[PDB]
Symmetry: C3
Amino acid sequence: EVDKVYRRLNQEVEKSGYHLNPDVEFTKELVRGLLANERRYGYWSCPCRLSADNKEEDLDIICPCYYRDPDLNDYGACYCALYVSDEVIRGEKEVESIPERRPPREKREAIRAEEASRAEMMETMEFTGKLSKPVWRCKVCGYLCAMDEAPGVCPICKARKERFERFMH
Amino acid sequence: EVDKVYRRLNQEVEKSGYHLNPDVEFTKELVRGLLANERRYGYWSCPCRLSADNKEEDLDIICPCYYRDPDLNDYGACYCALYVSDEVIRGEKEVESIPERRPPREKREAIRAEEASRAEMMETMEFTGKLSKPVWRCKVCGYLCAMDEAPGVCPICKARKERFERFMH
Amino acid sequence: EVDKVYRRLNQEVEKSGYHLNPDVEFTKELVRGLLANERRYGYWSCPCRLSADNKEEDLDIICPCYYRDPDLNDYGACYCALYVSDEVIRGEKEVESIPERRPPREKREAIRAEEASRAEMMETMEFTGKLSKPVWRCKVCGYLCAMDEAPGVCPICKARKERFERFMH
Ligand code: SF4
Ligand code: SF4
Ligand code: SF4
Ligand SMILES: [Br-]
Ligand SMILES: [Br-]
Ligand SMILES: [Br-]
Ligand SMILES: [Br-]
Ligand SMILES: [Br-]
Ligand SMILES: [Br-]
Ligand SMILES: [Br-]
Ligand SMILES: [Br-]
Ligand SMILES: [Br-]
Ligand SMILES: [Br-]
Ligand SMILES: [Br-]
Ligand SMILES: [Br-]
Ligand SMILES: [Br-]
Ligand SMILES: [Br-]
Ligand SMILES: [Br-]
Ligand SMILES: [Br-]
Ligand SMILES: [Br-]
Ligand SMILES: [Br-]
Ligand SMILES: [Br-]
Ligand SMILES: [Br-]
Ligand SMILES: [Br-]
Ligand SMILES: [Fe+3]
Ligand SMILES: [Fe+3]
Ligand SMILES: [Fe+3]
Ligand code: NA
Ligand code: NA
Ligand code: NA
Ligand code: NA
Ligand code: NA
Ligand code: NA
Ligand code: NA
Ligand code: NA
Ligand code: NA
Ligand code: NA
Ligand code: NA
Ligand code: NA
């Protein structure tokens, strides 16, 4: 039907140094699957896995999935064998059985929640150091305050802004 | 009516080295506004801004607002020009148009939530290092435990409290 | 009735260098209390304190409680005087009145929530450094990526996996 998607994929991955399975009809088969999965669930859900029909919960199995590279590295193929390793293509690598590396649902949920908290921390802290203010010190009385710029005049001794200095530490 | 509040303000700010607008009637005008805003919303909501009639959401525009000092520094006046800069009062500073520095509602909410998380972290950690316990080491068997004081006797070898030592590291 | 529990306790604590009150009948009294509290609430709630009949909220007063050791250290006895200090048993230590060290309900709740946040941080961060990936660098073009192992081939220059190196810093 559409061979268009097969070929544009083959070129997309070859540029980046990955490889599709060299057997053509088995691969185009998987392509049909991916297409159908896109029609049915609205994302490219791994063609050889049960989709949960919820994108958020499947982000790890949208093709290419999070298991592809480790699986290529250990077994010479991704779980469906859509992709095969640079080693298999040539010789060595001996394309072989691939266990399911994806963790079970409960485990995945824990991992996500942990990545959520971790991202929130990093966000909050990055956003933080962005709004922090430098500390200014009056050179007459030593008054300290925290502002982008030193105040017009020291509320203590009245020295002008230009007589403050950035303070450390 | 009440000029009482005008004058007590003028003295309150002059002590700290800020200045009210030298035009008297324009300033007392703003004072009336602030008073009314206090009657209407129960806080001194910036007289030249739309109040949301919720204190929590307006903490940034209670007068004096969070934009006053940066605005004095850049434009020689706060957004309403209740306050004018030390430079304008004398010469230079050329009192000039002030854009609205306050971010729009969505932005403000994000910023607040980020300051909330940041404060929770800092709180939780400060509260944390306060309850942490030192580590005590039996000098006979090396048993380690974490308590304000070493135990009456080592549960391992039975050496008395006075034969423990603070441990590092 | 059951003296079984009295004696197994006396041996359990003596091994660890704690001591029960040497008056036998006052102690076995407290034992009966602890038993009853176990029948009534399903945990060994301090026999001389009001139980809230909720384990989660009483974790600090399950016997032995969190106040036992500090109380032994300062007063020579736990709050009920189930336990007496190594000093009292012999001489010195002068067993004496013990105030209630447990903080009031509101305080306890705050402390717990703070320990919760602190534990979540530590968990999230520990779980974090466990999933972080090393950074690999192509030795031909300097391409950087973060994975357990370097890719089959550099998506940039095509150098094979074995021509990458662990990168710092
Ligand atoms: S396993 Fe192969 S096919 Fe299934 S998603 Fe991962 S990469 Fe795409
Ligand atoms: S702008 Fe001027 S008047 Fe309005 S709140 Fe800030 S300081 Fe008070
Ligand atoms: S006070 Fe004494 S009896 Fe009550 S719980 Fe703490 S240790 Fe057990
Ligand atoms: Br079709
Ligand atoms: Br998608
Ligand atoms: Br990998
Ligand atoms: Br590869
Ligand atoms: Br497989
Ligand atoms: Br100046
Ligand atoms: Br400076
Ligand atoms: Br009036
Ligand atoms: Br107020
Ligand atoms: Br400023
Ligand atoms: Br000023
Ligand atoms: Br303005
Ligand atoms: Br001692
Ligand atoms: Br010591
Ligand atoms: Br009974
Ligand atoms: Br229990
Ligand atoms: Br202690
Ligand atoms: Br003791
Ligand atoms: Br007591
Ligand atoms: Br290789
Ligand atoms: Br290396
Ligand atoms: Fe000063
Ligand atoms: Fe010891
Ligand atoms: Fe390269
Ligand atoms: Na996607
Ligand atoms: Na599952
Ligand atoms: Na500032
Ligand atoms: Na200024
Ligand atoms: Na206020
Ligand atoms: Na707005
Ligand atoms: Na302690
Ligand atoms: Na003790
Ligand atoms: Na327990
Ligand atoms: Na209480
Ligand atoms: Na990896
Ligand atoms: Na590989």
